[PDB]
Structure 1
Amino acid sequence: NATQINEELYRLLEDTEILNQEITEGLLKGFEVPDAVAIQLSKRDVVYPARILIIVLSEMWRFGLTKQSESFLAQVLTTIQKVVTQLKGNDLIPSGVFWLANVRELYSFVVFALNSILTEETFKNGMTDEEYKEYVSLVTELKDDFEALSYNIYNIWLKKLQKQLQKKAINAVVISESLPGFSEYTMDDILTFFNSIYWCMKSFHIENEVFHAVVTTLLNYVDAICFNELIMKRNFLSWKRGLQLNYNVTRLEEWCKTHGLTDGTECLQHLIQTAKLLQVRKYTIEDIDILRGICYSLTPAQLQKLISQYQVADYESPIPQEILRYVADIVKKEAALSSIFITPETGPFTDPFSLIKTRKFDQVEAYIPAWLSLPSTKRIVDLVAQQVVQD
């Protein structure tokens, strides 16, 4: 009956011991990420929990079920953050991105809600100033809540990504050797990593500014840790190794250039300049001044360390003592005018999403994914459809 829709629906939204169980344990914790090379996905196949949450929340606000919606959203926030926190392994990149979408979606909705409450005259005019004050306070608090959530999951995810990159890229970039015609992670693993991030953020309709931020952060991180690994290497810094490093770095730069990134070079600067230092001739004082010209991001002390641990090969002229003396004199000169290491950016970072104009919210169609095992939620949505038809 149409006479008993909103009634039953009400009695469904009033029970936050059943609904909370299905939502937090079934929908959120029991989430399934869709398939992303070139695979096209409609926006409805990605942010389905966001859509469902938006439906339940909207219908709760319609019926004035305030405290219940507050508990609901509290447990939802806690659950989402917990889920992102427990992310590990091969699913780190897609799942993360997945949630980064959903949360963002939610945020937009709330913004819209607030922008409806304050702009549209009908709301401020149609109800008491006390109730209006309550709703404004509530919705605002929720907006800030989701802001904080997105910040949290972004920084958590990014920190995890860094924790894996530290485990792969050191050996891949510094130690791994693969040159054309000269004959346990490689550069291909790194490229596969960054490609995973790209295709995931692309197929899941994520704003490119976030991609820019993430990859820039990760690149700077790689640059830092690999440089801090290289400078303490000894019986290792040879011309061949400089060539190899230059090769790997060049691969990364190529990926950046062919995937939108313009500022990919400045991130890897220390490694580039390091390879250049290891490759160029360093036999004359002029060659050293040239080296200073090229390596602008490298400090004189770092130059001294790098040069002093260079490995001269067989049939290669060793670096003169006059040169080393000149280097020490330069370092002394710089001391007359704080460590040789680079401090890696571990976090926290500014949420890139908090710098982008929030997505304009459009009307969500009443739908719940058929493959889910959430009875109450499905009954809710099904009722909501008939409700909208009625209005």
Structure 2
Amino acid sequence: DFQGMLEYKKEDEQKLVKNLILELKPRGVAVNLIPGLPAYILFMCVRHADYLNDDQKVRSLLTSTINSIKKVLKKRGDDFETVSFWLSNTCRFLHCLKQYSGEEGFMKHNTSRQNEHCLTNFDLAEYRQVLSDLAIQIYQQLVRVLENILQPMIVSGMLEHETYTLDSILRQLNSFHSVMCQHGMDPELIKQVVKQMFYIIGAITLNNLLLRKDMCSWSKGMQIRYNVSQLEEWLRDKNLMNSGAKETLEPLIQAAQLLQVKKKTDDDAEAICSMCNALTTAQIVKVLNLYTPVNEFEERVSVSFIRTIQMRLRDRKDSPQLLMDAKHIFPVTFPFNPSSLALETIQIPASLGLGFISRV
């Protein structure tokens, strides 16, 4: 009848964080069978220190933990799997510190047995704040690493290819999503990362239309709309249509629609002004100025037509922005997701190299 706590000797604390954090492999069998396993084990160690009422041990374990996570991200900070794994486990460690805090506001999902596993001697609120701030830093690093992977693929994948293709972009998105799922990343965080990836796709693609006459054509509008259709089918396949990702593409979609509509009459001008509610006046006017007719039997958009559009939009008080900030990162929100996992049932796998830890 174990109680869901883990004991270790003071002198072994550096071996503990070495095997549990510094040299722990994100692909290992045990941590893939039980996502968040390192966080759960670390928390069970915290529980025992708290049970002993040993303030020095609690302090030292928490600091060693935070410092070790920082060290692994400094060393392998360009490796997406490592960053994903540690964002997930930092969040799960924080979920544990909350779920088993003994504070009622965090215990609403607990079973009666889980409530028996709450900390009793220490208030770790200040350490939870350090962890939360760390999770923000890790999320920022993750989004940077993933953007650097996707960025070279976007223009060729979305615009040039009729070298990277759209399938290249989808293959990467599939890999990112698969990995975050394997790590047990909070579903709300996965949705934010996907939203952030759709944002850069839309922003880099639109910024290319806005800079290049050769990309502003009826045919390019058709290609973009087809490519967006496949990105939306991807969200549908993954159950991600509530992530906000599709909405990030609306300026691109409207620019593509603008490339295809009629651009001659007063009625056509009125339709453009109603359709392009996600584009600024500067962007609409730029696309119309750059628009390149397929051949001599299609006329350029006239100067007078563009002035009609400017006249109709004259009362909009919109942003002066032309190019999008493609590296803009939406501020992250973190959910609290207490789990059903019963600590008293957690087996310490032999593979982790943690024989010096004992169950209590």
TM-score greater than 0.5 by the shorter chain = yes
Q: 1:71 and 2:66 equivalent?
A: no
Residue 13 of structure 2 corresponds to which residue in structure 1? 19
Structure 2 stretches lacking a partner, 5+ long = 1-5, 108-119
Residue 95 of structure 2 corresponds to which residue in structure 1? 108
Q: 1:164 and 2:164 equivalent?
A: no
Say if 1:13 and 1:56, in contact at 8 Å, map to a contact too.
no
Residue 44 of structure 2 corresponds to which residue in structure 1? 55
Deviations 1:262-301 (A, max 9, x none): 3443210011111111122223332222222221111222
Residue 370 of structure 1 corresponds to which residue in structure 2? 350
Residue identity (%): 23
**Aligned residue among 279, 292, 298 for 1:311:** 292
Q: 1:352 and 2:334 equivalent?
A: yes
Report the alpha carbon displacement of residue 166 of structure 1 after superposing the two structures with TM: 2.6
Residue 28 of structure 1 corresponds to which residue in structure 2? 21
CA RMSD in angstroms comes to: 3.2
In the alignment of these two chains, the number of paired residues is 339
Residue 3 of structure 1 corresponds to which residue in structure 2? none
Q: 1:254 to 1:327 in 2, by over 3 A?
A: same
Say if 2:156 and 2:165, in contact at 8 Å, map to a contact too.
yes
Higher Cα radius of gyration: 1
Q: Greater helix share, 1 or 2? A: 1
Residue 214 of structure 2 corresponds to which residue in structure 1? 235
Report the alpha carbon displacement of residue 308 of structure 1 after superposing the two structures with TM: 0.6
Say if 1:28 and 1:49, in contact at 8 Å, map to a contact too.
yes
Secondary structure of residue in 1 paired with 2:299 = coil
**Aligned residue among 188, 193, 203 for 2:167:** 188
Say if 1:60 and 1:69, in contact at 8 Å, map to a contact too.
yes
Residue 339 of structure 1 corresponds to which residue in structure 2? 321
Report the alpha carbon displacement of residue 348 of structure 1 after superposing the two structures with TM: 6.3
Secondary structure of residue in 1 paired with 2:213 = coil
Report the alpha carbon displacement of residue 71 of structure 1 after superposing the two structures with TM: 1.8
Report the alpha carbon displacement of residue 47 of structure 1 after superposing the two structures with TM: 2.5
Residue 262 of structure 2 corresponds to which residue in structure 1? 281
Q: 1:50 to 1:153 in 2, by over 3 A?
A: same
Structure 1 stretches lacking a partner, 5+ long = 1-8, 120-131, 178-183
**Aligned residue among 206, 209, 212 for 2:185:** 206
Give the whole-Å Cα distance in 1 for the aligned partners of 2:10 and 2:37: 22
Q: 1:188 to 1:52 in 2, by over 3 A?
A: same
Give the whole-Å Cα distance in 1 for the aligned partners of 2:261 and 2:101: 61
Give the whole-Å Cα distance in 2 for the aligned partners of 1:62 and 1:136: 9
Aligned AA (2:201): V
Give the whole-Å Cα distance in 2 for the aligned partners of 1:13 and 1:214: 40
